[PDB]
Amino acid sequence: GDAKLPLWLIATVAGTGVLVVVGLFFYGAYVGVGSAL
Amino acid sequence: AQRTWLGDRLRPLNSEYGKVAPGWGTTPLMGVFMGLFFVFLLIILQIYNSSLILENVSVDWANL
Amino acid sequence: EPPSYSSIQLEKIQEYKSNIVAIRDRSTTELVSYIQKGDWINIDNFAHGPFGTVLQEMNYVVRNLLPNEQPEARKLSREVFEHLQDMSEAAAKADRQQAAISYQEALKDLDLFLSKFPQ
Amino acid sequence: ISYVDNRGGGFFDGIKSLFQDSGTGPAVFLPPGFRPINVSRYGPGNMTKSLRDLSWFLRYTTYAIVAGDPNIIAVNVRGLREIIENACSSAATLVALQEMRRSALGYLQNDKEGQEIALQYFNVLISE
Amino acid sequence: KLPEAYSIFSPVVDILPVIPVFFLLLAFVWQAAVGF
Amino acid sequence: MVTLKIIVNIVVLFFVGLFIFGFLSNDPSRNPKRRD
Amino acid sequence: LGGRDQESTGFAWWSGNARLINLSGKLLGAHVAHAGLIVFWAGAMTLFEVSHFVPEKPMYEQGLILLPHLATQGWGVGAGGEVINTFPYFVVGVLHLISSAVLGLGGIYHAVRGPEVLEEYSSFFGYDWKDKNQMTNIIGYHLILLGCGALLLVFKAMFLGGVYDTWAPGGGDVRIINNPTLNPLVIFGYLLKAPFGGEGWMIGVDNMEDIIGGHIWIGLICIAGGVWHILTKPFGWARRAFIWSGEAYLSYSLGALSLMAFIASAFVWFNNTAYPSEFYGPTNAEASQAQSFVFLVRDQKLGANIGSAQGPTGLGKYLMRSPTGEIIFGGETMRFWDFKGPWLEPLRGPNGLDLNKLKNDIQPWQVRRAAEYMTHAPNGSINSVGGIITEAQGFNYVNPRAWLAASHFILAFFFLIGHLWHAGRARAAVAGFEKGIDRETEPVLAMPDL
Amino acid sequence: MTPSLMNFFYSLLAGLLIIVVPATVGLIFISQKDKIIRRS
Amino acid sequence: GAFHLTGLFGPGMWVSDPYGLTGSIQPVAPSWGPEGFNPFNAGGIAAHHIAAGIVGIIAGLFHLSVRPPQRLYKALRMGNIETVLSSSIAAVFFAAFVVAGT
Amino acid sequence: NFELIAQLLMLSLIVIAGPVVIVLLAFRGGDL
Amino acid sequence: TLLFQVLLAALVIVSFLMIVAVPVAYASPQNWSQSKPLIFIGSGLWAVLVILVGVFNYLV
């Protein structure tokens, strides 16, 4: 194939892909159906 | 030339005699500390004369 | 810029002046007899108490009265405080005629504030 | 001239100033277990041989520089330390001659060419 | 409303504490390239 | 009890006194290797 | 060709500084890039604090921690804790946020582009971590400047406006302090007090003049300790009582910063003079006395006589007596019988809370502070929840006395961890078994049997 | 600033600027011109 | 300065009122400002020997460490005992004029 | 809302503004 | 005060240009010669523009 790309680079974008979907959950405690607001 | 217990603790305070800093030395450090001291003596002479009277000094017998 | 204090003085500022006028006629009291005879820390009761409410009360000349004469009216209200700093801190001096002339200063500024600003 | 109704000299070598990060004069270190010796415990007749040697350590260094060969330093120093081991301190000589070297190469900071010559020649005096 | 006539920068200066946390995680990312 | 207080106050200053110039006399030279 | 690697220095990607122990050039770039980062939080947290601020709501309600640090020096505070000009809080952070780029330029020059060692380059800056005259000159350069910061608060005090006083007559006010306490019998005598309740060794420092007398005596010995370490060496006993390496100097300091933040986790919990309650919030010792006081004077309006009534349990419901004679507030408030805040100091009589002046001399300002301080007790949730844990989350206030007191205690205890864990490696640095015991000459097989 | 301090401070300006610097420049910039001869 | 006139380990100097009536002994506070320079304020005399003593300390701490220059040692003839005596008497006369004055 | 997305714009500009200093060094050949 | 948009809006886009271009210049030794000066025109623009938002703070 020889299309290999440095893992470290996709270690960031998978890591901040993990970070935005657990950062969205802590946004969701503060508006929505469980927020007591 | 009599050694005592006293004189074997002060002879390093009086071991040298003519050891001297080199030529012209730390003279103008002493000069600018003198010129600050004469200006300080000139200030306090006219504090007391009331000729460099300031606010809230009033050199007088109304004091503590 | 508002001249007409219809309810603005008659409910607020004529109760602003009324509460510290009420401490004022009382003030020839035990407090003068404290500095006459012999009670050191009940003056510090009075300075942070009945004179603690003479000053935290006398604080909203900003928040109710005439913002052109506001910056000249701060330091009128600051000199009444800062002379009464000498009243409570001459209690550790233990000599009650440095505090007695400090109390006579509170005649020169409190009623001079009360003579001023009917607006 | 005895007298002492006006004059007496000496000293100099102290705390004046300077900020410089230049002129690396091979830094001198003290050997461990060294203390500076007092003159009163040492003796005035014992130190008058001592202080003339300190001029004599550089007087032969000035002789060897114009001689163009460090042989006269490297032949009048071998076993001088084991001669003076009884009287003088061996540790006091190394720290004196090192700062004699370092202060001399500080005087040669302007020429930039003979300073590395005397650094070769003073190092013969230290290593011998 | 802290500023006098800035007033559109209430978005940008709200996040400005959080960037020292981002300075630590960048040191992992810089180390993820070369060194291991 | 004030008679007791000094007796307790001696023995704290004795034991802490024999801790504070315990370490002050070489305490990095009985570390069984170099400079022991 | 690379300074950093696994097998040239024996350190991995973690323990990710210890390549910089002997390398002196980029170690300066480590700290100045880090000191740019501390100033970067120091401006921007305040620049986030303002524009999340409103001036008419009180300071502690929003959960904000640096705006009450600025209000101690009185940067536009009129009287009683209301603010009048927020632009003095705008200038102080932007002189740190703009200064963080200038501090950031140095720590990125020396860590990348600058030299790797400087002993050769300057001869002033360079060190070995063994040259004992040069290493004490480094401390002497900072102590003369740390004394200059210590006289910097008192030069703000005695000349430029003044420091805020919570013991001002009329609630609280800024005032220019005209006599700091120079007598050492009281202020060095604070060090010789008991660290328990009652005496309050470094914590109970009422009459703000004693704090501003402190930084007279702090900076005038920090100057005097600054010029000592320029001129002289450590002593002969000091050469053989310490570890002299690149390590332990962090660990001597990490022992101190752990000790300093235990004190910082007690200045912000108990003291009501250096940290004012009208900016930071009331203490636990303040709010429990504020709980009983508004229920005392509530009773006065009702008219039941205070002294006669016996609580639910035999004691006085309102005014019982403490173990040493001060008539104090009753109930569960016997623990905080040492409460000396600014309100109810006009209720302190000769003995304590005197009942001649506890009746007929409560003021409407006096109760409404304690009414506010009752409901603003330090009682938090994790998130924003306030009040008792059992109570529903109707309103939010974490009371940043409490919310900053535990946050240093996370870091005060953690700095005791690493200080102990560097003191192991530093003592094994000079002893040579930082990598473990030997195969051949094991020292315990030389030891005799038990 | 007080009206007798600055009236004293103008002397320390003028007693410097009229007496001292025209003595110092008025001596050393004529003695350095007429240097004495040591070679005999 | 500090350990005798300020009440730390000692009783203070004499201080009275103006128009001297109730003059007694109490420890005076060292006043550091310009108000301590008028000699009728006793707060300068406590602030005297603290401030003159600390520069008396920093003189003699300096004066042990350095040596005089040879452009002064041959000029002031500092090896001689007599020169020092002359200097001392001259200084003393200066000190006797002020307590003739004050 | 207008100045909520410009907040999260100013997030999403500034987070990956970090690692674009790293990849630009790691592909031009700068010594990392 | 409509100038106080475009001055500080130019500051936030030129200081975003300094979070990224300064480790590039510092990072590469080979291209350092070209870039060494470019910081003194880089930061020298950023210095006098932070000075110019300072005087325009007080003027409005």
Ligand code: CLA
């Ligand atoms: C002034 C503080 C200070 C300084 C300058 C140092 C300096 C040093 N430490 Mg050290 N340390 C300190 C305090 C300090 N220590 C304290 C207080 C602790 C206890 C916690 C430690 C614990 C520690 C360990 C555990 C060891 C060192 C080591 C080292 C050396 C190598 C550093 C390294 O590679 O980092 C490595 C950095 C990391 C691996 C990053 C770790 C990230 C942590 C786990 C994050 C924790 C959570 C954090 C708060 C973020 C939370 C975010 C939130 C949203 C969840 C270096 C000399 C090493 C050594 O012996 O070398 C001499 C060693 O192995 N340190």
Ligand code: CLA
């Ligand atoms: C406070 C945090 C901090 C700081 C200041 C440093 C600083 C440093 N570390 Mg380090 N480190 C840290 C945390 C930190 N570290 C942590 C938590 C870990 C554990 C993961 C490590 C692990 C680690 C290792 C293992 C090593 C270092 C090394 C270094 C040094 C040289 C780095 C180098 O040459 O690459 C330079 C970096 C680059 C060229 C990459 C580009 C990245 C840029 C420069 C980041 C900054 C950009 C910034 C946003 C722009 C500023 C704007 C400007 C206007 C001011 C440097 C002094 C190395 C060393 O000892 O030196 C040889 C080394 O081997 N560190």
Ligand code: CLA
């Ligand atoms: C802890 C801080 C610190 C320390 C110890 C050093 C130390 C050093 N730097 Mg340096 N530097 C720093 C911070 C620091 N820097 C910062 C923050 C920057 C970014 C602006 C720089 C930028 C920098 C450059 C660009 C260079 C150095 C160089 C040097 C070295 C030579 C010293 C010299 O010739 O200066 C001579 C000293 C002066 C000319 C005096 C200047 C003093 C300042 C600017 C005046 C203001 C003082 C201030 C008011 C004091 C109060 C501080 C207060 C604001 C907190 C020296 C090792 C040089 C180097 O590495 O060698 C090639 C070099 O080229 N530095």
Ligand code: CLA
């Ligand atoms: C924080 C700044 C700082 C730092 C890091 C140092 C660091 C140092 N100083 Mg130093 N110094 C400083 C400020 C500082 N100094 C100031 C401000 C002054 C002026 C007063 C001095 C005056 C000074 C002199 C006069 C001497 C030093 C010495 C020393 C060296 C060894 C310290 C030692 O063994 O004593 C540690 C102290 C002890 C072992 C004694 C025990 C102390 C107590 C009883 C232990 C228990 C304390 C307890 C936990 C807390 C209660 C406090 C109180 C209520 C008792 C070290 C390099 C010594 C040295 O080497 O000479 C240069 C030395 O003789 N310093």
Ligand code: CLA
């Ligand atoms: C332990 C020593 C000691 C003590 C505590 C006293 C105590 C006292 N003596 Mg006394 N005395 C002593 C030793 C002592 N004496 C000795 C050894 C002598 C013989 C020289 C005398 C001779 C003596 C006389 C003749 C008299 C006293 C008197 C007194 C009383 C008042 C002192 C006074 O007015 O100050 C006045 C002191 C001074 C003005 C000090 C002069 C120093 C000048 C101002 C400065 C000199 C320049 C300075 C050294 C250099 C600059 C320093 C600068 C860098 C800081 C006082 C009770 C008086 C008395 O009758 O009491 C019974 C009195 O008349 N003393």
Ligand SMILES: CC1=C(/C=C/C(C)=C\C=C/C(C)=C/C=C/C=C(C)/C=C/C=C(C)/C=C/C2=C(C)CCCC2(C)C)C(C)(C)CCC1
């Ligand atoms: C866990 C981990 C991970 C992950 C990570 C992440 C998820 C992230 C990272 C990182 C990052 C992501 C970082 C960031 C950074 C950033 C930065 C570094 C920044 C800079 C900037 C600045 C500092 C700013 C500036 C400014 C200002 C000041 C204001 C205005 C605006 C501007 C822009 C101008 C991985 C797996 C990979 C590896 C392992 C570890």
Ligand SMILES: CC1=C(\C=C/C(C)=C/C=C/C(C)=C/C=C/C=C(C)/C=C/C=C(C)/C=C/C2=C(C)CCCC2(C)C)C(C)(C)CCC1
């Ligand atoms: C103004 C002020 C004040 C006052 C005063 C002061 C400032 C003081 C200081 C003081 C001090 C000054 C203290 C100190 C301390 C010390 C310490 C803390 C030390 C420690 C150390 C240690 C503990 C160690 C030891 C050791 C050991 C054990 C071993 C070895 C040997 C040795 C010795 C080293 C106050 C507080 C009121 C408040 C505010 C400020």
Ligand SMILES: [Ca+2]
């Ligand atoms: Ca913002």
